[model samples]
Target chain A: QYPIINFTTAGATVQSYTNFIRAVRGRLTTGADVRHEIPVLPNRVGLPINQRFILVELSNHAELSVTLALDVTNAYVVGYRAGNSAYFFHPDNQEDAEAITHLFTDVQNRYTFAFGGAYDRLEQLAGNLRENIELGNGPLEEAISALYYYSTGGTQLPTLARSFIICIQMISEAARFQYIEGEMRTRIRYNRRSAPDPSVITLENSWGRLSTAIQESNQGAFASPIQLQRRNGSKFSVYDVSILIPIIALMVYRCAPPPSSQF
Target chain B: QYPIINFTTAGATVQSYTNFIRAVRGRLTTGADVRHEIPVLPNRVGLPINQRFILVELSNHAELSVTLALDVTNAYVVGYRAGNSAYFFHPDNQEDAEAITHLFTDVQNRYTFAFGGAYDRLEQLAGNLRENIELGNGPLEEAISALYYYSTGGTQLPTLARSFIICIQMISEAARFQYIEGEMRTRIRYNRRSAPDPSVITLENSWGRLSTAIQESNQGAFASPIQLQRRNGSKFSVYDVSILIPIIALMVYRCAPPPSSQF
Candidate 1:
């Protein structure tokens, strides 16, 4: 698409001008009308290394996991696993937590005078995360793809916890004790939000939510807007990158290195 | 303690430095060991930020809220309401949430048809965090200080849903409908962690945890390791600025401004 494609010269039409332009374009987004978000992990990080780490593993396999928890490198893995999947806890996330775990242990002991296994001390939690098939195949995937897309600005894998939460909600139980090292926080919230009604849950809006939800289920979450015309006003708003500018601003801004504290 | 502050350059410090030789001793933790974790908000974050922000606003008048929900700006704040607190909601937060809000409204309506003035939407949650008390005087302040200290290495505030989780678990619901825009997901997991029984929960470790929890409760989570001695190889591991290095790195690094488009 360049006027100087066939020409050559450092300052002119250019020998490999068009070819050069195309190659440079490939390094950039070119024209996808889309910004990409890809996770970037730097290997040589921090002041230096004699690195001790904190790991969180979620699982149901007691025997194997218990062994791992004992391993020096593991630290802690918080999640659910009782005979009944309803209750959950992380006994040692803090100190008094250990005391509380004593109670959960007491309950376990009562049941196990002659029970099946041993669970380390963890506190009492009311219930486990709500789980169902849809949690796995539906909203979860939408959340993940959206995480990758949104976090990446449309480019690559999303790193860190919030991204981890969006995905973990779907597949944690898949392995015995899978763990992710920490990064990106962006605060992933699992808000137990409200629902839609029927009598007045209009055809368009419901269909919109259902459509949005469905599309969120299919189109990687950010595949959000549909031509929606609300009854309240005829004026329309397009769900574009504008709303995302803030999130985008984060990665794109200039950042200075941390000051050393040797003094 | 530097000789440079008192002495001139190499020419002047030569009195004992060059002739006698100098021995400057650094402490046990001579160099600052660091750990880094940044709140990575991939510009294309969380799958995507819509175009449609379902912002929620609580009010002194419910008569107005219902009107706004219909007003389009209410976009969708999904929750329950009493005559006083205008509890709200965002449907995407949970499935069937939209449905639940409808029932609350129905409850509001049915009673309005006859008796009126009450709502049952507030479910039984655990204790509201202690307020105006030492709890806030303690933990909230601690958390805030920690957050401020931690979030900045060289930049703006960190963002993430999960980070929001930890801090909010302590401060949220403190307000009638208080919401934090974001940050501070201190995965203070009640991990449903395994307990180390009575003998296992030894004095040294127990004291340490209790100390950490107490400090975290009072210090914004992450008053983490003062000195942890694990028996496994059981040397003391101190929590350094290491894990926080990455978070600090984001600000310190010089970021190139993003390319934008209207296409």
Candidate 2:
């Protein structure tokens, strides 16, 4: 565990601060562990941002230590966390410092938590019909603006990828959600995938594939339409999957009949 | 400027380091400004990873301060910098340290440098058909990997999203690039977009507008055929612009008629 940051608005002077700064600086010069203090943003108005740095040591002779800054703030500590994901620390009080220590101790769980948060948001959006999901509007659209502003100024880059990372996570979730909800509903693996197994190449083959099959015989078949006009003459523009996933969720939610009892 | 993270393997007592830790801890406890020290990892084998962090301060009332760790080490300084971009400082030798401080200060240039580094890499990949652009094998690929393991344990997430962000930037770049190359090549300011600009919904009447006049008599105008299969009969699968961007670039590069003399 690294050092703990304890901010008090107390008597910590620029000189004592300078002295302690030298003191911790001495710790590194001596090659021991160090707990660094990430400063308070003076311009952070109203809510003083309280953040602690944890040098995430990638274990067993690994080459990097990601600095995991425990975001005591609501905002995704906007920008910065993007580059490396590790840091160092010195403890303040053993009492409550235990939990803070594990902020990134169990990196996987932390990751899954973040991943799951976005996943659940997407699932809710996809599973149910709702509103307009523009870049700055809906539930997830906020990432776009926050990121845009952050990238434009705030604390930028480094994690510009995180916004998209969450974007992919949501879409990948939607991709699976789409197949399961739309395609799977028809077959159900005997009730499982409905049938669930899933391919194709070539332009015509692509068409034959894109030909929205009406799940061929929900056991007993009906006609869905095998012939077509646009097929031979024109090319249809396609929206890519990442952008399409959430839309799929929204569209599906909009028209979907409520799932059966099992769902 | 925050507190400095000075460390040493010398006879630094955990207590002194601990005491100094308290002094600074008191700064926040007492509340003051400090530049902190991040220790060099003990488990770091081989070339050694020495990194010192500085809160990447975005000036002029900017609300976020990203931690910019001066990678005094050749490694964990992990990978190549990418995304939105932005940096740190130290007075190492008073001389070399002074210039290094500027590396992160004035911030915008540092932001652009980090950003441009990634930008050039993608520009290279997107503009050319060279190789597979493997996510984990090339130069930035290593960073991709270091990020993976640190983020995930063996392979991780932060860098994973970076691949996509570049994918989108390239794609968004291609969206315009394609229309310019693929679309413009057919005619240019003269050929026009046939109908030029495009919006989200109106995909149809535009298709009818498809019939171009003589800018018309290109009696050379043998019909490219205008029939089709699945349009309106059922809504079709479309890839989103984000995902399509790079794919378009790759596809363009793959069959790009040698990138033309202009390229």
Candidate 3:
């Protein structure tokens, strides 16, 4: 049975961030075909943000899923200016609006065209998920912050910032249940320590931590209500922590030597 | 005083459409630069059903603008399936909440990208508008509509439909507005009988007919309240139609003999 894992972190650049997805895919599948979907909406007028979830569904009935959230708020806020008559800002001027809009549009067009070009890879990934029933994998969480620098008086200042957080959760509940049946045939006694542990617990916990970190970052302060409500009210919020805290405590208690035993 | 040439039955195929735009450009500029900003948002969401508009600002002192409105509600409708679901339907997917969300996201992505691409053209047009004012070329406007057909079936149906309208308007306006002043100078002086007596009654009637036609078209049924309201409810809406209709009507009225004389 694969042990469920969850992990998360944050930084100033997407490049500095680790690719948790590559690691998850490596353990889940033997094939080279791996796919992910990032669902993103425009962060603001003329600011396009791209996001997606990575899913590694193996050929052997196992799956690893990672959700990636990218912050692009600074792309809009950095260029604002307040004037007495006309509130001039970063992209408000006609020339700047044209340039920025051109850049954003190019990015969006490339992403869409890339998805269309890679449709076959995505279809293959979906096929693997349907075929795979059991697989082994670990999970990881990561975050990174990206800062945009603007020159002021010959020095660079952080004019804007973007961050990305990726959380990977490995699911092994089905495998754990199957393991109990296999162990029972050998007449091995089974309890929480022996078999049938819920992998979702750890997975949920890691995501929760990452979610909390994102909320605390202040970068997403102006995020929409839907995003805020989702982060706060998701079922996965505290369920992982609730399950892991008690189970791990019980395991530690059981493994400890008895107090009556003298050294 | 360019003769208003109306091609009532232009085909809406991609190849033909490109030819039309090129022809219009060739006529309007005569070596001067001609740029246009085409907004693709209104058509993406299937809002006001068959409406389309293109803002073409010329380099000459007189900026020529055109607005095209097509009644495509009576045309064919196409459908697309959700990424994960088995059922297929229109891009809007009014029946399924999941599908609706998917449709909105898809449309939103397209709009963001399309508008992004057009930003540069808009800036160029704006620059030309300012230059035209300085050069003494007054602004001009024209509007028209036609049928369109698509070979592929997908969410891009609306895009194809709107593209057709834009291509036609650009071509027609370009052909009509290029060399208009020179044509007027030569023709108006020679054809004393052709010139309308500067009577208030004829001018009011002409202006009323032109304005009413444009106002009705501007109030297209497929317009989205949130998206189109911003672009449509502004000065662009009034200024666009106000200038173009009179030019188009005057040119057409001049080329054709009086109805009583023709009979």
Candidate 4:
């Protein structure tokens, strides 16, 4: 089963993903409008690393059990890594976290089952969690686990924590940092041939399994534009501060000297 | 022999001064083109006690001679005693220093020893000086000497340097000082005044003196615009630098404590 983490409401729409792709193409072709949003994420919190379980009872009297572990970090060289594909998305349009989520969802829909299909299955379980269940007055994490278990019979799951330091560094240096200082000036280039297309390959591979489950349940046709539209508006407004604060904080954080224990 | 200072080409023109009153009248009537240009005669060297000379010599042989001593600091002011009428001429139209000099020369032509003229000769002299000369220049000291010499000739000239300082301060803080400042403010008005009329004022007095001097010998015209313009342009340009540089230097010179002397 493929795991979906950090999906905001605006990020769940198919249209949002389309908009993201359009933005990416515009940046790639025009060679203009390449400004990054400061503060990649809102408040820096430990990546959601928690165990979850899923249990699935098939119509053929067979039960499937699966355990899922999610490790979230901002450590991805866009073309090199499978999970971190943000390089394909421009930061100017990525102002909204929800748009990013929807874009990721669309990518996953195409590339599932290619790389062992492990991530694809996890994403499918997560999609199931989004649909079919009312998480009213319940712990969101627990509800997600329950949804996964009902879709795929999972007993125990373990979560792993990852550091966001690398992601932060990459983002900070993306604008002006030269890989080789003072002589042959060259910046770190992403999306090379060696690197996978973050938008296509990673998402397609991860979401392929989830799409299969959705098709089987006949809920594949369910499309809601409410979350997407709401996210679009929110990204245009509320998300401005969210993105700005982080960049300011990151600059301040980097410039601050380490604390000394001298009396 | 009349001593004349010419500032014609450096933006001063005789027409600028003659048209000043007309411009003021126009402003009051039609609300258009209200500006003035006054002439100034700044002393290059500080005067010693008991030495007095005509600050400005008019066409009618009427002269304005001021008498004052150089104080310990060698600073002085401009004006006659109290109860003397003060006149204001606006120099808003004249932006160039040369133009102002020409205007002053034109106004000086109106000066006459004729009794009960339309304008008081002393007041006119003071008005011309006030409107033209920039503040912080030694006009008060000049006026004191001019008025003292005009009233009592060489007899009224101050012998004691300390007494001259007191008189200089008195005149500087007088209504004439305020009149000068007020006229300058009204004319320049933060540089919002309209462009001046395109007319020229010929220094007939200088021409007349030069013609008579030439008839007497080979001394040439007392004051020729062709010659005075060139001389005034060179002298004032240098003088402008002298005036501006000191003010700028004082402004930029910050008195900071030495590194070793810091508390």
Best by DockQ: 4
In order, what lDDT does every prediction score?
0.23, 0.25, 0.23, 0.22
lDDT of 2 by residue, A182-241 (tens): 322222122221111211012212222221221121111112222222313433232122
Q: Kindly list the per-residue Cα lDDT of model 1 for residues B1-263, writing each as its tens digit.
A: 11110111122122322221111111101122211222111221222222212222212111222111111111122232333323333333343243334333443332111211111111111112112112212233233333233222421222211112222322221110111101111111221212122212122223324323322321112334443333243444333233222212111111222233111
Best candidate (score: lDDT): 2
Candidates ranked by TM-score, best first?
A: 4, 3, 1, 2
On lDDT, the stronger of 2 and 4 is 2
Error of 2 at A71 (Å): 62
Q: What share of the true interface contacts does candidate 4 keep?
A: 0.00
Candidate 2 lDDT, B29-52, residue by residue in tens: 111111011111111123211223
Q: A57-148 in candidate 3: lDDT tens per residue?
A: 12111221222211122111112111111111233346334433322222222111111112123234234221121212111111111111
- After the best TM-score superposition of candidate 3, give how far the Cα of residue A76 lies from its true spot, in angstroms: 39
After superposing candidate 3, which stretches have Cα over 4 Å from the reference?
A: A1-17, A20-229, A234-263, B1-14, B17-69, B72-263
Tens digits of per-residue lDDT for model 4 on B146-167?
4444433342322212223323
Error of 4 at B138 (Å): 15
Q: Which ten residues in a row have the lowest lDDT in candidate 3 chain B?
A: B134-143
Prediction-by-prediction clash tally = 89, 89, 30, 57
Q: lDDT tens string, model 4, A12-86?
A: 233332332233222222232111222222112322212111111111111211122111122121111122221
User: Could you give the fnat of all candidates in order?
Assistant: 0.00, 0.00, 0.00, 0.00
lDDT of 2: 0.25
